[PDB]
């Protein structure tokens, strides 16, 4: 509350800290998917059902021009790509694999890093 706080955790790296762990999502095998916005003029059904679009690039120009205000928006990000994917692919599909494929990756690298 006020004049009362909770000691201070370090944040200076968590933006060299997020980076990191972008690349390596950027670079795993099963990034296709998500490396760029969908294409809404060439799928059907995209633009109308998944409100919020996010992908890979998209993060990384926010980051690098910043625009998450702290690293638990960044997470939100990253998860949002995810449950894109899980409202857009069937799960027996390759894209649908590739996000369950990620997102676990991600929350590894994320509990591993900050937790």
Known sequence: SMSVKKPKRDDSK?????SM???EMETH????PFLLPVNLKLVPGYKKVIKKPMDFSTIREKLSSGQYPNLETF???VRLVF???????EDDSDIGRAGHNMRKYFE??????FK
């Open 29 to 32: 095998e099963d990034a296709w």
């Open 21 to 23: 762990i972008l690349t």
């Open 83 to 89: 449950d894109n994917c899980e409202t857009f692919n």
């Open 108 to 113: 590894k690298k994320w509990t591993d890093t």
């Open 75 to 77: 997470a939100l990000d």
């Open 14 to 18: 968590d933006l060299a800290l997020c």
